[PDB]
Ligand SMILES: Cc1cc(/C=C/C#N)cc(C)c1Oc1nc(NC2CCN(Cc3ccc(S(N)(=O)=O)cc3)CC2)nc2ccsc12
């Protein structure tokens with residue numbers, strides 16, 4: 001693969017100039033060893049002061065692994081790299097991947113290091129290994145080959161990947177294989193038993209063509225918009241009715257025909273919050289009609305691939321997190337709820353970081369792109385700690401929610 | 413002749429589209445021209461510059477400057493125009509080491525590398541852009557035109573290219589001598605180690621032997637500074653470090669920049685002098701840009717400055733870093749959004765100190781500020797030492813547990829332990845999760861007319877208690893808060909309150925303990941007095957009783 005594909009930046013855009021954030025000693029030492037051997041293998045080269053660009057780098061440990069992995073935060077370079085109409089004007093996103101019973105995710109990013117990078121573009125991949133206390137100048141490198149995490153790497157490599165797969169693909173024409181950045185999503189409609197073998201024979205298939213032993217498996221038969229449910233009770237207090245009317249008023253922004261007139265009139269007077277109110281049968285009927293309305297899907301909800309996906313997350317307590325994915329307000333394309341985030345019963349931020357990664361993974365499977373997150377956390381807390389729990393090879397965008405949303409109660 | 417390796421040249425370019433400078437040489441006096449001709453002649457025989465023909469169309473003006481007693485002339489080429497057109501570089505001299513991260517060094521040698529600077533060649537293809545012209549005597553001959561072969565002083569790329577070339581030169585020597593440290597500071601090179609003076613001196617001689625490979629001669633800096641080194645505003649002593657003397661000036665009339673260098677001295681001193689406070693002195697600046705405006709010190713700024721004099725009365729020193737011992741950070745609340753901290757390994761010997769000031773906002777609480785201080789110290793500690801310190805915080809473990817388990821945001825503080833040093837950070841109120849049985853229920857509402865600013869606020873309760881208060885010069889949002897305040901004022905120790913104010917919920921659900929709104933502060937003071945408060949929200953104008961009745965009362 002000696003011929004490099006020519007790559008350019010977007011018109012009137014310079015290369016990234018992103019500051020390297022501080023790293024602990026053990027992450028620096030890990031990056032020094034990794035990059036020393038990458039330099040020996042020709043994947044990267046030292047650079048001089050005539051290169052003013054920079055992209056941040058840190059170190060992670062992938063799921064169920066103890067070997068340090070180098071992760072470059074190419075987010076700025078990705079939005080500055082030319083739009084890629086690869087060999088086509090696009091691959092239509094495989095709408096059947098989200099329907100398979102089992103999907104295994106395979107880290108294939110190491111294949112990128114076989115293709116050299118356009119020599120005129122290498123300077124824009126510059127990154128710095130910082131030193132502790134600025135006691136030595138940072139170690140400056142640039143990439144000679146397609147780097148993991150860069151937008152152009154799957155596009156430039158895909159023609160090489162299309163042929164590596166298609167012997168496997170015509171053996172199993174009902175296996176859906178999808179590529180997003182460094183990862184391959186291989187979904188089969190067969191029960192786990194021989195799925196692992198089918199992933200393993202892909203895994204050895206690839207190594208015969210020039211790996212990482214690793215794969216995380218998902219089951220997207222689940223992924224819908226969770227229904228709005230209303231309580232079913234034999235005795236309602238004034239407070240219960242008030243919370244119900246508030247929830248229904250919120251749901252009325254999403255669903256047509258929600259009514260709270262009969263339920264509100266039960267609260268005629270100035271009653272103690274704990275007093276039991278018997279429901280009239282007009283109120284029961286109205287409540288029953290609202291229950292029926294909430295059983296149907298929301299009217300006119302469609303995915304527009306030109307707009308951003310928005311993911312909101314609420315902390316619900318006791319390790320529970322709710323989330324909604326949408327592009328337009330009250331037009332949820334997907335909602336969900338999480339519990340029992342592994343390895344962090346006493347760390348809110350670790351739980352949030354794992355929720356972000358799982359929502360992003362779901363969004364990749366369903367739409368082939370990552371959402372923009374609205375995170376219920378102060379910026380300084382998130383920014384200090386999220387890299388400590390990050391285990392994915394991509395990174396989405398995020399913004400911060402500083403005012404407590406009233407609607408946390410409605411997804412409760 | 414001993415063959416020497418060439419210093420690898422850095423390729424340099426102009427900014428895209430731009431061309432080299434074309435600035436006219438100013439007229440000079442005959443005496444200055446004679447001076448510049450001699451200076452450049454010796455520079456030329458040393459290889460620094462070279463005569464060029466008339467084809468070069470670029471030019472940069474040259475000047476001749478003197479000094480007071482130095483009875484000679486100085487050359488100065490003003491590369492301001494060329495610097496505007498030169499590419500950006502990796503400025504590898506951005507951040508400096510903090511002394512508190514440094515480790516003890518038994519011996520330190522200083523080497524002068526000022527003349528090694530001129531062994532760094534300038535990129536051949538860029539030299540043409542450095543052209544300058546000595547005007548001739550009486551303008552009767554063509555001016556002598558030169559260009560640089562070496563890094564011009566005053567040119568944009570010279571500091572970055574010089575340090576990068578030296579670092580590349582020194583790289584194998586440092587890597588194969590792990591028991592020494594080397595750093596470059598302007599024309600000075602400092603080599604420290606823990607070797608006995610014999611082996612140390614040997615390593616220095618080996619370093620000179622190494623630098624000779626590139627033809628670099630490095631005598632030790634003339635007029636040896638005996639400790640401490642005066643470096644980057646610090647005093648580096650062999651076993652202690654501190655800032656250079658902090659002298660608060662005596663004044664009976666301060667203007668806004670006398671306070672702004674006061675703030676800078678105190679900000680500089682706050683990294684080793686514990687308890688420095690600057691808020692009441694910094695607040696005296698906000699809205700002015702005329703620096704000679706005399707502003708009276710408030711009684712609170714004289715008090716603050718006085719307290720700073722008492723901390724500055726005696727020099728204090730920080731210790732250097734011992735990697736074998738723990739790293740500990742301790743924080744204290746100072747009041748008015750201010751926090752101080754000390755980082756140490758052994759008790760009473762600080763590596764460094766510091767302070768944190770609350771962010772600007774309408775409402776806040778101590779736990780959020782303490783959390784922000786922790787994140788700042790965490791990030792600074794990773795910079796300086798490469799690790800998070802163990803924290804000692806003035807907040808009970810039970811208080812923190814209650815806070816983060818109930819707070820609507822995700823939050824986290826790393827490994828920490830309680831230190832019982834008042835004032836302790838606490839939660840000042842906690843709202844109920846469920847309505848209170850037997851507690852009176854207040855349905856509150858407020859309203860204001862947008863054009864006349866006339867409003868009402870009040871409540872009605874399940875016991876028939878009622879109140880409406882007329883208000884002037886008010887808004888919807890203020891009357892909604894007023895209504896809640898009145899319910900708290902007029903209720904017993906336990907109370908259920910029902911509002912339709914999303915604005916009031918959003919404030920109270922943020923759990924502030926202080927506000928820039930006096931009404932919110934009054935509500936906070938009432939909440940502190942209660943035993944149980946349940947706050948419930950309902951949507952407005954949906955026929956909900958209690959709420960509909962009071963809405964009528966207050967909406968004119
Ligand atoms: C080596 C060095 C010197 C200086 C001074 C500049 C000036 N002007 C600055 C830095 C940043 C240096 O760089 C590192 N300095 C250290 N530690 C220091 C070394 C100096 N001592 C003070 C001292 C020691 C011995 C004598 S003595 N007895 O020889 O007269 C006199 C004074 C405090 C700790 N550690 C590192 C690690 C990587 S770089 C680096």
Ligand SMILES: [Mg+2]
Pocket residue numbers: 857858859952963967
């Ligand atoms: Mg009203």
